[PDB]
Design a protein around this nucleic acid. Sequence first.
DNA 1: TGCTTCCTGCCAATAACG
DNA 2: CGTTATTGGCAGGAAGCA
Length: 116
Amino acid sequence: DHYELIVDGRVYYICIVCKRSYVCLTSLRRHFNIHSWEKKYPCRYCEKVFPLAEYRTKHEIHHTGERRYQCLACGKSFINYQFMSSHIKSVHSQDPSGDSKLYRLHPCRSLQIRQY
DNA sequence: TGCTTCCTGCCAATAACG
DNA sequence: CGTTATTGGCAGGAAGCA
Ligand SMILES: [Cl-]
Ligand SMILES: [Zn+2]
Ligand SMILES: [Zn+2]
Ligand SMILES: [Zn+2]
């Protein structure tokens, strides 16, 4: 299913099919569904089907149009991290991955997922 | 070149086990 | 229902479009 490669005492898990390397077995497993399609993650709104549950979720948020990502400098909201970061970098000349917290991620309310 | 989607370490939430 | 296993949300850089 996989094979282990060990260099300098660090374990790596290698996919048998595409030879991708992973530091944890969970990632190797999550990844391998792309090859096996043991599990199917179908969009609840259209016909599309995904190999990872998280891919399906990001896609379903597109259907609802919910904007969970909010710029704290001007209040504008965005559907995903990428739009948010691009806005803060270009309009506000700041990096949200920096030491400062420049955005708020709202809970997902337009559909049912586990929360924090 | 700028969206659009993909990827994977991390680990909190959820579930499976028993 | 306490212990263990699995799921998948998140960041943010990569890769994939056109
Ligand atoms: Cl919203
Ligand atoms: Zn693979
Ligand atoms: Zn869909
Ligand atoms: Zn802003």
